[PDB]
Design a protein around this nucleic acid. Sequence first.
DNA 1: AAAGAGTATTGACTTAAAGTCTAACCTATAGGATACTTACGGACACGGCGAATAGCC
RNA 2: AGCGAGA
DNA 3: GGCTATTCGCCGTGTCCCTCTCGCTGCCTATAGGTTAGACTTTAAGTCAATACTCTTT
Lengths: 98, 58, 90, 174, 58, 49, 116, 98
Amino acid sequence: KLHHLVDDKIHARSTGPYSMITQQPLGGKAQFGGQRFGEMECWAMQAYGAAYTLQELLTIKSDDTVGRVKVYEAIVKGENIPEPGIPESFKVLLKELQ
Amino acid sequence: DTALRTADSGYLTRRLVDVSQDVIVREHDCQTERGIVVELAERAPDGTLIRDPYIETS
Amino acid sequence: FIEDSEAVVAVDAVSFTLLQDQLQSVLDTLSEREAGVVRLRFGLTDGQPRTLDEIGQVYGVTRERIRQIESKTMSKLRHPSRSQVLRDYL
Amino acid sequence: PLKSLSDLLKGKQGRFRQNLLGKRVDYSGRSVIVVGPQLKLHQCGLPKLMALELFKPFVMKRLVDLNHAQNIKSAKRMVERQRPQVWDVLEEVIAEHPVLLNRAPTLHRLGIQAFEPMLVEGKAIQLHPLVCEAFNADFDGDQMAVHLPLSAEAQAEARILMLSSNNILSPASG
Amino acid sequence: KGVPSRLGYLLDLAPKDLEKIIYFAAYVITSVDEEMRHNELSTLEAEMAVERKAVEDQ
Amino acid sequence: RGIVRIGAEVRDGDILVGKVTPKGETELTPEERLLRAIFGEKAREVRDT
Amino acid sequence: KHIEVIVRQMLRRVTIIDSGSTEFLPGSLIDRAEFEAENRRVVAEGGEPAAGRPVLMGITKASLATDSWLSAASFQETTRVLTDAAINCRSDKLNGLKENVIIGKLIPAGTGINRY
Amino acid sequence: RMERVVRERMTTQDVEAITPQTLINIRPVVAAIKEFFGTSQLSQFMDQNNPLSGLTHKRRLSALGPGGLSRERAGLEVRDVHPSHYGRMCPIETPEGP
DNA sequence: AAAGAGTATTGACTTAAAGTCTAACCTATAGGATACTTACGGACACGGCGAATAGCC
RNA sequence: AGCGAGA
DNA sequence: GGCTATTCGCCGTGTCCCTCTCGCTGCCTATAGGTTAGACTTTAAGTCAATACTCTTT
Ligand SMILES: [Mg+2]
């Protein structure tokens, strides 16, 4: 029996802590792992032509600090998911370039 | 050899994706007369059409 | 665990949202006269907790009335009719 | 060396290729994978605890609608202790809700496909064998991440474009 | 510093030179005189004749 | 002593050890004040962690 | 066909031998469509055909020659590309896919184009 | 380091009023050994997964560390077996990772 | 028709809070005068520069 | 920041 | 005869080095001002309680 037990591997995350200087919630099963939707996954998503789901992922699942509470509210109350905003990382980039 | 080769392959894919990041379909047809020629079968010296081996990808 | 351990929850936020919804509702069930005083005593209506003097002045009445009714409201609000639905939000 | 104001921008660990185009995302899971041959091509197992957690908002809504809990916070308490009544509602909610299953690395377009999830007992995403090649995912300790579309557009996209049964032929050579 | 040094190319200053200027290692002129330059150059030719004669005298 | 009983079965989230941190000063909410009045219980300060 | 697509992307720029009299520095790598557009602009009002020759440039160079600084910066060698784009006061029109991803609005592909 | 400190202070040491005990400052040595045994690359957290794992963590020769080849800078020719390895190092046992 | 409860009065007592003033106790700054006056991987690519020969001043 | 490990 | 330009080599600096995930350790003295903090003396807000009259319900 090798020490790679499933109980130590299984993990799930709906909402939890977020990183400090940026949103895009904290990674790692230790804290509350948000699974990395890295670049190749973006490419695969584009190749399907699947655009709305990509925007959903990168904006309101990860970063958008205002939309996030809004989608939670919509889910809780059963309303249409709102329109995505601007991810909070683009503005930190803007401030750093400035 | 597996590790370095997958690293270089990933980098190459990144390059190719960036170059082709803007090749998307726009029109049904341009009606352009221009085109390329593909050989398909080659004439046999005795006289016969043998299917070119690499036809399925051409 | 301190890493952004002071951000929004979206669970406390919605809990507070439905909190004020149900508070305004349960308060609307009873008579308005109790409601204005209970709002401004603690400053719910506009964020300013005013005292017996201010409420009496706003409604041209003595502070003693307001103390009675705000005590009457405080005593009457022990009714499970109001406290039962609004029990777990504490 | 001190991380200068420009070191924030360059390299693999610069801001461009760790935080802008690639982000960590909520509403996601990960587990080891075990072959399940009893599933249909458009299905994938999903352990009960993982599904409960992922769907905790929706199940809360349903069990408040069903009056199993009086209000939202009582429902949240109901779910946090996994009270027995919250399993049937869970079966009700998960139904007809597509989910994407990625296996890093996504060498090609077929590295991420949408299945219709189904509950399974123990802690292991029961994958359909026939899609194994598409992921190149072979059952000796691979870990497959799960993502949950939310918006109506996203759910349509997953249900239509990405459904495993809708992608049989390779985009490369067909 | 980013080669090619865009300041250097703009002002046509060699990179090492520019560096020595902006890190306080070598002086640079920024303005010069023209016609009155001619007239006092003749006056200055006389004044350096005087100075050369004095140094040759010592 | 705020320590779980020895040799006791526990579950995720169960209090292993009971600790409370001083809350210092926190601006309270009027809605919470009204709530606390509805229940007429201790507002309490020392934060729970 | 995939390969054809890449080599197509590779052959889209022409080198300028004769500047003619129209703002084309010799040795400039200019898109063929814009080259023709300039030519139809200058045939009238006095014709000065600016001769050019087709040229083959590597994938990296072709990528870094795009008209989008936010994508080139995302690609590689960040410092230099930003310095260049800044000196040129270059404006990115946000038309590609990487850019639309970065700023988090909808990609113009698949379900994102302006007809669907 | 300790000898440097001593040698420095000798210019300011009044003659005949100095003894070794007041002359030797031991703090740098203890600091060096501590910072070695903690956070030094070749002072690794013991791996007691099972008695064999602990045993094999001993007798383990790592080619990387302070004054050694790092994974990146290490070429592809140090990784391969040498005919001189016979009897001195196992050609079989090796990590499979990077 | 009677009794009980609520809605008021008034006074009487009580406690937070709060506006001064103190005091004392931290806290931030300046200064110190015999004489000494110098540290401690490897590949691709392009741009800044060795070695040559011929022509012009 | 540093170690070790899975695919 | 020497220097510079047109033609080669040559060397140095910069850039890049797949993804995703898991666990564990790291001298002295003197002035002046702030400073809140801490107590005293006001309030202001709160709580208790006697009383009594009127209205509603049984
Ligand atoms: Mg495997």
